[PDB]
Design a binder for this molecule. Structure first.
Ligand SMILES: Nc1nccc(-c2c(-c3ccc(F)cc3)ncn2C2CCNCC2)n1
Ligand SMILES: N[C@]12C[C@H]3C[C@H](C[C@H](C3)C1)C2
Ligand SMILES: [Ca+2]
Ligand SMILES: [Ca+2]
Ligand SMILES: [Ca+2]
Ligand SMILES: [Ca+2]
Length: 348
């Protein structure tokens, strides 16, 4: 393919002539993104140029991790890959990676901000998050920082999870993070992401942020006002003695009845929130359990809530040299097989 160069976000992008009319639509994890027109299929796409993908061992492994993850993700509510390209003619020239997915014009903050959402619409939005989570969780992938700005939404409210499974080694909002993550507790499971869904769903229903804490301690106090003081068993999870002593010394608070917090909400929504917003991560509902909850009865379809193929994450434990990660990434670029344009069939 013939490539062309265009300065976007103050830097030169080099892309195949197939992709036209690039215009910036914001930053993503470790890269910046442009919307484009795919002249091969007439579809609108989003193209992410990774920033400094091989500058250090941290960047190089992050680049491999992201390409491996995105090549594996094949679910209608999870960002996946239509294409991956590099202007490099060989590994020796290889220093830039571009990832291509379907264009999603908005994030969840664009949906709720200026819109009084109906309950049926909230159901659809949360249903899609949970369907995507069941899939990624089934591959032993956790998001860990799920929030409205990590949920891409298109013009018809179709939603995809992105920026999951990233980070190993800019000020982000922590309002949606699971307490065990925000506070660095010693163990956690996939249901960290279900806490985040609870926080998102609460805000879609009320129009107000659930736990808008000014710092870690203020946020914890807001959380405890809703869910009540935890038992000594929860302290088991917290390494820092100072943190445990602080929590233990707080004046005891009762759990609130969520029916008195989400006044006027669908009682089924309140019940689901009660099951998601639990401090005990072993008591928190899973994504697959939540999809069966009566709140989603008009959307639930077991035939269309798939799990993922096994995902080999053995590379995560390995320390390799920059050029090894780079060569592995080049291999993944070259071996990528674009999916069919139409991968779906009418149901039954
Ligand atoms: N508009 C849009 N549409 C789809 C995805 C993205 C996208 C990607 C991304 C990931 C992989 C890929 F291959 C291509 C793009 N990373 C961050 N974003 C965000 C850019 C602005 N915030 C919401 C989405 N942006
Ligand atoms: N957002 C809220 C924070 C705190 C807990 C609960 C009820 C009140 C006090 C408002 C949610
Ligand atoms: Ca169906
Ligand atoms: Ca079809
Ligand atoms: Ca479609
Ligand atoms: Ca069916």
């Amino acid at each position: 393919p013939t490539f062309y160069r265009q300065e976007l976000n103050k830097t030169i992008w080099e892309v195949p002539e197939r992709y036209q009319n690039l215009s910036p639509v914001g930053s993503g994890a470790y890269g910046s993104v442009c919307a484009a027109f795919d002249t091969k299929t007439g579809h609108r796409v989003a193209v992410k140029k990774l920033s400094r993908p091989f500058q250090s061992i941290i960047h190089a492994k992050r680049t491999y991790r992201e390409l491996r993850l995105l090549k594996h993700m094949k679910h209608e509510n999870v960002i996946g890959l239509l294409d991956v390209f590099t202007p490099a003619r060989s590994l020796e020239e290889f220093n830039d990676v571009y990832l291509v997915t379907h264009l999603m014009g908005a994030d969840l903050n664009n949906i709720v901000k200026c819109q009084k959402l109906t309950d049926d619409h909230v159901q659809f939005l949360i249903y899609q998050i949970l369907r995507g989570l069941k899939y990624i969780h089934s591959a032993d992938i956790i998001h860990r920082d799920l929030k409205p700005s990590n949920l891409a939404v298109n013009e018809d409210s179709e939603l995809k999870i992105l920026d999951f499974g990233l980070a190993r080694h800019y000020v982000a909002t922590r309002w949606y993070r699971a307490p065990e993550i925000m506070l660095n507790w010693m163990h956690y499971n996939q249901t960290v992401d279900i806490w985040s869904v609870g926080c998102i769903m609460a805000e879609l229903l009320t129009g107000r942020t659930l736990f808008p804490g000014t710092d870690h301690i203020d946020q914890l106090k807001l959380i405890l006002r809703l869910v009540g003081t935890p038992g000594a068993e929860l302290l088991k999870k917290i390494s820092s003695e100072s943190a445990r002593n602080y929590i233990q010394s707080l004046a005891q608070m009762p759990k609130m009845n969520f029916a008195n917090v989400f006044i006027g909400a669908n009682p089924l929504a309140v019940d689901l929130l009660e099951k998601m917003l639990v401090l005990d991560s072993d008591k928190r509902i899973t994504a697959a359990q939540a999809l069966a909850h009566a709140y989603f009865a008009q959307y639930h379809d077991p035939d269309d809530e798939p799990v993922a193929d096994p995902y080999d994450q053995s590379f995560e434990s390995r320390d390799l040299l920059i050029d090894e990660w780079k060569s592995l990434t080049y291999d993944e670029v070259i071996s990528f097989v674009p999916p069919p344009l139409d991968q779906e069939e009418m149901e039954s």
